[PDB]
Amino acid sequence: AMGSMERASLIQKAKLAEQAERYEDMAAFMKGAVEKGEELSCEERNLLSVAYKNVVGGQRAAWRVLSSIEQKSNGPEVREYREKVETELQGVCDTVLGLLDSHLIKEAGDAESRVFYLKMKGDYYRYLAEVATGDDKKRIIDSARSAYQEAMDISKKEMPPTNPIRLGLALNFSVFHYEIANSPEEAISLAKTTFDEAMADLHTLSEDSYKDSTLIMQLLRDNLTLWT
Amino acid sequence: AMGSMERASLIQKAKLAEQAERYEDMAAFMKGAVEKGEELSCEERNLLSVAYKNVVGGQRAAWRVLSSIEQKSNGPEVREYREKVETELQGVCDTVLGLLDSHLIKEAGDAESRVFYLKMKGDYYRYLAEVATGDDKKRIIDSARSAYQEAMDISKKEMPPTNPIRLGLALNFSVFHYEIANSPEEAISLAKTTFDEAMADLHTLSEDSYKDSTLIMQLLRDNLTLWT
Numbered sequence: 001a002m003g004s005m006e007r008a009s010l011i012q013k014a015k016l017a018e019q020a021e022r023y024e025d026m027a028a029f030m031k032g033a034v035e036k037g038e039e040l041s042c043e044e045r046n047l048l049s050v051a052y053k054n055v056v057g058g059q060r061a062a063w064r065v066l067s068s069i070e071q072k073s074n075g076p077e078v079r080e081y082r083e084k085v086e087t088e089l090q091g092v093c094d095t096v097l098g099l100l101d102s103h104l105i106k107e108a109g110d111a112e113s114r115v116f117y118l119k120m121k122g123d124y125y126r127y128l129a130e131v132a133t134g135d136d137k138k139r140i141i142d143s144a145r146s147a148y149q150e151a152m153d154i155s156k157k158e159m160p161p162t163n164p165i166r167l168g169l170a171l172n173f174s175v176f177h178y179e180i181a182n183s184p185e186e187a188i189s190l191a192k193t194t195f196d197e198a199m200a201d202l203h204t205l206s207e208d209s210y211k212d213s214t215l216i217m218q219l220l221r222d223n224l225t226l227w228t
Numbered sequence: 229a230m231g232s233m234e235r236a237s238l239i240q241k242a243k244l245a246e247q248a249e250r251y252e253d254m255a256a257f258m259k260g261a262v263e264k265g266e267e268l269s270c271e272e273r274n275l276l277s278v279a280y281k282n283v284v285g286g287q288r289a290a291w292r293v294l295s296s297i298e299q300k301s302n303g304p305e306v307r308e309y310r311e312k313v314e315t316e317l318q319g320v321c322d323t324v325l326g327l328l329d330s331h332l333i334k335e336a337g338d339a340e341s342r343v344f345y346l347k348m349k350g351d352y353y354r355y356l357a358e359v360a361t362g363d364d365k366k367r368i369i370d371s372a373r374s375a376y377q378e379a380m381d382i383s384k385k386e387m388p389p390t391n392p393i394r395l396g397l398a399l400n401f402s403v404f405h406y407e408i409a410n411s412p413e414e415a416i417s418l419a420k421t422t423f424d425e426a427m428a429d430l431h432t433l434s435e436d437s438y439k440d441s442t443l444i445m446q447l448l449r450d451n452l453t454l455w456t
């Protein structure tokens with residue numbers, strides 16, 4: 001539906017949708033922009049991520065309320081409605097994963113773009129894994145793991161330890177280990193090593209970079225407090 | 229799309245959607261329930277109102293952000309996107325007004341149902357009037373006025389001055405006079421007479437009815453403070 005709209009107009013409308021808190025519209029504009037086929041700038045990658053994170057975050061919150069009511073009930077209506085919300089969540093994750101596969105990741109050569117997209121791939125497989133069961137669940141968990149691990153390998157070779165995308169990748173992979181992979185010790189070790197290696201590199205930063213990196217460090221420390 | 233679902237299942241799913249803060253789903257379930265053709269109970273009328281008030285309230289908030297950016301700009305993109313949001317708002321108001329016209333109001337004989345539906349008719353024409361211009365705007369304003377006035381006439385004959393639906397009707401008609409009809413003195417007189425007549429009737433109420441009525445009285449007093 002966005003094929004007739006100019007790329008620059010889709011980006012401008014995504015920014016308006018964000019100001020209006022219209023995140024489904026924001027995500028549809030950014031999907032249209034990706035589908036023009038050109039690579040995304042740093043600001044445009046952030047608009048894509050913010051749009052879909054807010055859409056899927058509303059779905060995940062609704063799914064968790066519905067799944068809790070269903071587990072306490074355990075007619076068909078709670079399970080049917082939890083399944084409807086689940087299918088729509090799955091469809092948003094499939095959409096994001098499809099944009100990353102066709103063709104954002106294959107054209108991303110710089111570390112900042114490639115790490116960003118592989119982190120998104122890990123996040124959206126992680127959201128699929130939260131609602132998956134059984135075996136299917138195993139291959140979805142391993143897809144999230146594999147995307148996070150490739151992002152981590154690149155980030156350690158190519159970015160300093162205080163880089164905010166490297167920090168946010170390590171924060172989300174630590175949450176994957178704690179909440180999805182049943183690996184709390186791996187989650188704690190990754191968050192602690194990431195925090196400590198960033199702390200040692202803060203002396204290299206400007207005032208504004210120091211604020212950006214310490215913000216994410218405090219999220220690592222908040223989880224370490226929750227988990228220990 | 230809801231024709232195959234049982235009435236009672238639509239009501240149950242509306243209540244689940246409300247718990248999940250899924251108000252567009254809530255409104256679609258309640259539209260399906262209205263379209264079964266049976267009259268609505270008091271609880272079901274409240275579910276209908278809450279669902280659509282939250283859907284249209286998100287649209288109105290987005291429209292106001294977009295209209296403010298547009299007025300400060302004054303390419304086509306801000307006006308196009310404000311127009312898209314406006315058209316979708318108009319369509320939700322048309323949907324609600326269509327349910328009231330086909331056939332909720334004509335079968336509503338008791339004062340509590342008929343006042344409730346005529347107040348909704350005034351509210352949704354009021355939301356159309358917020359985004360209307362010019363003449364068209366005049367007939368939409370007079371439709372809101374006419375629906376509120378018929379609701380007021382019934383409410384004064386049939387309900388005590390502390391009845392919460394009568395209080396909420398008077399609060400919203402006062403807002404119509406202040407914000408839509410350019411009649412701040414009428415708004416202030418209606419809110420003050422409504423507050424004072426309810427205050428005089430509170431001695432008749434139970435603890436729980438007194439809480440319900442004083443809550444709405446405090447909204448009347450909050451507007452009187454804003455307007456004087």
Ligand SMILES: O=C(COc1ccccc1P(=O)(O)O)Nc1ccccc1Cl
Nearest residue numbers: 056057058059060061123171172175219
């Ligand atoms: O409460 C949270 C916290 O999740 C974190 C915390 C640290 C890093 C990454 C995440 P997330 O990618 O949202 O799971 N997320 C959440 C959970 C349900 C719906 C919406 C949101 Cl944003």
Ligand SMILES: O=C(COc1ccccc1P(=O)(O)O)Nc1ccccc1Cl
Nearest residue numbers: 284285286287288289351399400403447
């Ligand atoms: O800030 C308000 C206050 O509106 C009142 C106040 C008293 C009575 C009725 C109304 P409303 O029917 O929401 O215009 N409403 C609002 C305005 C824009 C979007 C969402 C909402 Cl709920």
Ligand SMILES: [Cl-]
Nearest residue numbers: 080081084241
């Ligand atoms: Cl359903």
Ligand SMILES: [Cl-]
Nearest residue numbers: 106107108109
């Ligand atoms: Cl490449």
Ligand SMILES: [Cl-]
Nearest residue numbers: 013308309312
């Ligand atoms: Cl548009």
Ligand SMILES: [Cl-]
Nearest residue numbers: 334335336337
């Ligand atoms: Cl009748």
Ligand SMILES: [Mg+2]
Nearest residue numbers: 005006007008
């Ligand atoms: Mg072009």
Ligand SMILES: [Mg+2]
Nearest residue numbers: 075076077240
């Ligand atoms: Mg049932």
Ligand SMILES: [Mg+2]
Nearest residue numbers: 083086087131
């Ligand atoms: Mg399922």
Ligand SMILES: [Mg+2]
Nearest residue numbers: 039107108109
């Ligand atoms: Mg490239």
Ligand SMILES: [Mg+2]
Nearest residue numbers: 111158159160
């Ligand atoms: Mg580098």
Ligand SMILES: [Mg+2]
Nearest residue numbers: 233234235236
């Ligand atoms: Mg039936």
Ligand SMILES: [Mg+2]
Nearest residue numbers: 012303304305
């Ligand atoms: Mg432009």
Ligand SMILES: [Mg+2]
Nearest residue numbers: 311314315359
């Ligand atoms: Mg228009």
Ligand SMILES: [Mg+2]
Nearest residue numbers: 267335336337
């Ligand atoms: Mg009847």
Ligand SMILES: [Mg+2]
Nearest residue numbers: 339386387388
């Ligand atoms: Mg009576």
